[PDB]
Design an enzyme around this catalytic site. Structure first.
Site, short mmCIF file in Angstrom:
data_model
loop_
_atom_site.label_atom_id
_atom_site.label_comp_id
_atom_site.label_asym_id
_atom_site.label_seq_id
_atom_site.Cartn_x
_atom_site.Cartn_y
_atom_site.Cartn_z
N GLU A 35 -9.70 -5.26 -3.78
CA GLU A 35 -8.50 -4.06 -3.37
C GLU A 35 -9.42 -3.09 -2.22
OE1 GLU A 35 -5.53 -3.27 -2.20
OE2 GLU A 35 -4.78 -4.87 -4.22
N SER A 71 0.80 -0.90 -0.31
CA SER A 71 -0.18 0.24 -0.18
C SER A 71 0.53 1.24 0.27
CB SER A 71 -1.32 -0.28 1.23
OG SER A 71 -1.66 0.89 1.23
N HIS A 108 -7.84 -6.18 0.92
CA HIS A 108 -6.47 -5.06 1.21
C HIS A 108 -5.88 -5.43 1.93
CE1 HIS A 108 -3.82 -1.42 0.43
NE2 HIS A 108 -4.29 -1.11 1.68
#
Ligand SMILES: *[C@@H]1O[C@H](CO)[C@@H](O[C@@H]2O[C@H](CO)[C@@H](O)[C@H](O)[C@H]2NC(C)=O)[C@H](O)[C@H]1NC(C)=O
Ligand SMILES: *[C@@H]1O[C@H](CO)[C@@H](O[C@@H]2O[C@H](CO)[C@@H](O)[C@H](O)[C@H]2NC(C)=O)[C@H](O)[C@H]1NC(C)=O
Ligand SMILES: *[C@@H]1O[C@H](CO)[C@@H](O[C@@H]2O[C@H](CO)[C@@H](O)[C@H](O)[C@H]2NC(C)=O)[C@H](O)[C@H]1NC(C)=O
Ligand SMILES: *[C@@H]1O[C@H](CO)[C@@H](O[C@@H]2O[C@H](CO)[C@@H](O)[C@H](O)[C@H]2NC(C)=O)[C@H](O)[C@H]1NC(C)=O
Ligand SMILES: *[C@@H]1O[C@H](CO)[C@@H](O)[C@H](O)[C@H]1NC(C)=O
Ligand SMILES: *[C@@H]1O[C@H](CO)[C@@H](O)[C@H](O)[C@H]1NC(C)=O
Lengths: 534, 534
Positions: free
Chosen positions: B326, B199, B439
């Site tokens: 995600e 991320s 995610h």
């Protein structure tokens, strides 16, 4: 006076002819005039009622076809020639044909066929339009009308009384007026008249549904692969006028006044106008005809769209639909890389020029938007996928989505809608495979040609054709294509909420919902907003 | 002086601690300082190298975590708390941690983990980041760095030397400089250093790949669910400056000059800044953090996009990928109608506000364009389809498509790209089913937690985790995740032309091509053109 082929009408007496049909016989009255010949100073003018005649009008043979461009792309090929004029062409072409069951009915269902042909061609005398199989099989009086096409029927100098525009739609109207006034003598019921037509004919049917001056002349309607709001079916008065002067510019015409221009055009022999008529459209496109109906403020009070939104139209029942591959013919004839004898695999390059050709009024962004909507990004260079994607683009944009728009608007105020999707490819089709279920090819089944064995159709095709002919005829007679208490599968009503339709083919009926919604929301909602914004 | 836990570095001597791992033991040096404490007048300033110390630095326990917003949406819920700071928070937080195989290696592969956390949170000490399973299993020296987040690490008053912006990226850089200079004493090879992060950490990795001042400090990179070009990962200097003054406006600051503003902000206790930091973003969106990297002309010479286009970046090998879902976390936390304990079926209304929230910089037309691209028009009112459609919109727009853009640009100049799509949902996930393959949830497998039985993973999950850990480690060591002459299935190179990637799950490997191309051509090509045009 008194015999089955002799009928007396408010315009005079006519003499029919006996015709054989599937081992029986019926009566046929061909070439009955419904208007004065639109020749000389009448060229471009509104039609006039035919003056009554004394004596017997000989109605035993087909009339002349109206002056039109003749397709010669495939000399000898039956697939293209079955649509060309099969009679001498003449400006004196306003006649209608009637097929009547024997013995003569007392008061039965009437169907009036309006031919298509992009408003620049078409004939009522084509073999695929022979009304006998339908009249005989369904016991309906079958009428075939005719009307001026091209500049003859649509040259528009709004404001002028000499070339006002829409005369070909007025021609149709006059024929409908004649059927209204006289079909009873042929044993037809003037209260139960259904007008049906395909492509420009289906658009015409819808325009009569819209036009106040036409609504009262018929009861219900069938539209095949055509809608009055199709993008190729109408222009503004300003645009018509521009095309009319451009037409005069190609014929060396004095262009100082409407009177001057019109005078010159009435001077030219028919073929002189046809020879240059494809040079007037101001942009390059899939479709190259310039003379079509005009939103004039008379035949059409306001924009087609506002009329549709407000319910300004005849409220009744309608039966309509499309063929699966509406776009293939247009591509063959007007897009590069498409040929009758190759598989027409399309280069990603020929694909891009294809979309431009198909959405001529789009800017770059809109061109990209169309491209993205029809491209399989996992396999963007597949020649068959490009070919079929273009087929869909053209069919969706010019026939299917305009029709889904018309049907959704109509159903909100109408009194019953029935929707079909014809996807059976005829086993004997002479056109290449890549063309699929071709625009125009449901007509042969509506007219029952598959019942004639020598035509080489399969047994199931004869069955599909009888089911179709019966749906058309039952709907014309009652406003529902289904037999009251039959035990056959039921064709449901298309409603605002469920939007059901049926496939029309050789397999057991199947009901679906929202015919091509994904694509039509793009063509009817998104793309326009995109082009208005950008 | 002389014992396995005692290491002498250019900054002084440090004393490690022996730690148990899967029935064996390894060394761990935790909390080694790499910079001076960024406190007092140092708040917002570029970091300074840690001054060498005499004596032995005690490296046996985890350091403090940097000041950050702490997630309290689910008090007690392990799923959210496993990401919260597990040590005291302090501005004095610039330390790194090293896990070293026993006995100490001579010159082996080094991996440096950069934590994610949206540039406003994150800790190197989290249990999911415990480096021991990887160091031990793959015989790699594992480094964990830290860096200032929020305003502390990203407040940007461009032009000022007191709060220039990007200090948190400089913090990372300084840690990479320290590893470069000292990892050899811990038995790590400074020539074979791979930086990896998830991320914001994956975005950071890419920003170091771009920044000239960072390229020389490492050999290769791994990016997980993050790209330097993500729309949430960077702002312009003008925008940073606006947010910095808005931050001062929330703390009753004198706003007449940078010096005045900065002085005031350095006065506030940490928590005072955190309490008001979510009030500065100027538009409503899924993401509500304001302090991120700035395109400053120094750390980033020019726009990220021009750098990508021209090849202005480190050319080497990269390994990167995304998780299937995600977007679910972002929706849960920032979109109405999503809850941890319901199935979060989305009203067609909540769907529309969801897209607005997701594409905050879009006009109406662009909002419609997104909506049409993700709506199944055959079933537009399906609450699960709306929920999953929104999941895709957010994931595609903020993580997946920006990454596919980065990977396609990079591969053109890079020296080897390996792409993955992780779609295995952990059997023990504590988050609701509707969230899918969340995610962040591939991290536990990269770090080998599935090898610890008490954690309740399945046998195949332990297998997936070993395959993953080995791919990461083999790639870090050689620039290829595959064993030279192994007989396992081969992860192919992602090339410009074929664009191959592999799924990463419990079933036999499968190679695919053009990861989410349909959607990413829309987000990377069409939508932008649409918004620039309109
Ligand atoms: C078509 O129109 C007819 C008559 O205008 C509709 O039938 C009427 O239905 C309403 C409510 O269902 C009743 O109050 C009337 O008594 C009915 N009249 C008759 C003669 O039956 C019919 O429902 C309409 N059909 C559609 C599909 O819109
Ligand atoms: C029905 O099928 C027959 C069988 O092929 C067609 O007959 C051929 O027609 C072509 C062109 O007229 C001739 O060159 C062949 O000699 C014919 N072959 C045979 C075996 O007769 C026939 O044309 C088809 N019918 C229609 C109306 O198209
Ligand atoms: C990564 O870079 C290396 C070296 O820069 C590439 O290997 C060279 O390949 C070229 C042409 O294939 C040869 O002329 C050289 O002799 C090679 N050098 C070496 C050391 O082998 C390698 O192909 C690049 N890999 C990728 C995937 O781009
Ligand atoms: C692995 O699974 C077990 C089995 O359910 C989990 O143990 C339960 O944990 C909750 C909360 O601690 C307790 O209220 C129950 O009493 C436990 N049940 C049993 C049968 O032990 C355990 O927490 C899971 N391990 C982890 C690390 O989450
Ligand atoms: C009608 O025309 C056909 C062919 O033109 C002819 O054979 C027939 O005799 C005509 N009938 C009359 C009464 O003129
Ligand atoms: C290092 O710190 C730990 C805990 O703070 C302590 O138990 C240990 O004795 C310390 N070692 C030295 C040499 O200070």
């Amino acid at each position: 006076d008194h015999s089955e082929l002799l009928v007396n009408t408010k315009s005079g007496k006519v003499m029919g002819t006996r015709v054989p049909v599937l081992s029986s016989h019926i009566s046929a009255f061909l070439g009955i005039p419904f208007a004065e010949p639109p020749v000389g100073n009448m060229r471009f003018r509104r039609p006039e009622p035919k003056k009554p005649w004394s004596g017997v009008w000989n109605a035993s043979t087909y009339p002349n076809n109206c002056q039109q461009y003749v397709d010669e792309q495939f000399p000898g090929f039956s697939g293209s020639e079955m649509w060309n004029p099969n009679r001498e062409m003449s400006e004196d072409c306003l006649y209608l044909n009637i097929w009547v069951p024997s013995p003569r009915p007392k008061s039965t269902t009437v169907m009036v066929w309006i031919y298509g042909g992009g408003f620049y061609s078409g004939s009522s005398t084509l073999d695929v339009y022979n009304g006998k199989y339908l009249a005989y099989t369904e016991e309906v009086v079958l009428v075939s009308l005719s009307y001026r096409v091209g500049a003859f029927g649509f040259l528009a100098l709004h404001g002028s009384q000499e070339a006002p525009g829409n005369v070909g739609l007025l021609d149709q109207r006059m024929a409908l007026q004649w059927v209204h006034d006289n079909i009873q003598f042929f044993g037809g019921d003037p209260k139960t008249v259904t007008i049906f037509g395909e492509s420009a004919g289906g658009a015409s049917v819808g325009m009569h549904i819209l036009s106040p001056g036409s609504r009262d002349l018929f009861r219900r309607a069938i539209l095949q692969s055509g809608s009055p709001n199709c993008p190729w079916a109408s222009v503004s008065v300003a645009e018509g006028r521009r095309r009319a002067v451009e037409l005069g510019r190609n014929l060396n015409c004095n262009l100082n006044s409407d009177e001057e221009l019109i005078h010159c055009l009435r001077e030219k022999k028919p073929q002189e106008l046809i020879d240059v008529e494809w040079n007037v459209l101001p942009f390059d496109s899939i479709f190259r005809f310039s003379f079509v109906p005009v939103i004039d403020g008379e035949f059409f009070p306001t924009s087609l769209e506002s009329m549709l939104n407000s319910g300004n139209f005849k409220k009744t029942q309608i039966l309509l639909g499309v063929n699966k591959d509406e776009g293939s013919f247009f591509l063959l004839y007007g897009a590069p890389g498409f040929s009758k004898d190759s598989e027409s695999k399309i280069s990603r390059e020929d694909f891009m020029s294809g979309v431009k050709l198909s959405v001529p009024h789009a800017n770059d962004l809109g061109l990209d938007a169309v491209t993205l909507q029809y491209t399989d990004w996992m396999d963007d260079n597949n020649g068959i996928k490009n070919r079929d994607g273009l087929d869909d683009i053209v069919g969706d944009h010019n026939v299917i989505c305009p029709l889904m728009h018309f049907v959704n608007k109509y159903t909100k105020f109408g009194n019953g809608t029935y929707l079909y999707f014809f996807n059976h490819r005829a086993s004997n089709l002479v056109w290449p495979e890549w063309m699929g279920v071709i625009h125009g090819y449901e007509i042969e089944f509506v007219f029952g040609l598959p019942l004639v064995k020598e035509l080489n159709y399969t047994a199931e095709e004869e069955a599909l054709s009888r089911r179709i002919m019966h749906y058309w005829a039952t709907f014309a007679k009652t406003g529902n294509p289904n037999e009251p208490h039959s035990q056959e599968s039921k064709w449901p009503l298309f409603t605002t909420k469920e939007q059901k339709f049926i496939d029309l083919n050789t397999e057991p009926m199947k009901v679906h919902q929202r015919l091509r919604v994904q694509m039509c929301v793009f063509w009817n909602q998104f793309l326009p907003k995109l082009l208005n914004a950008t």
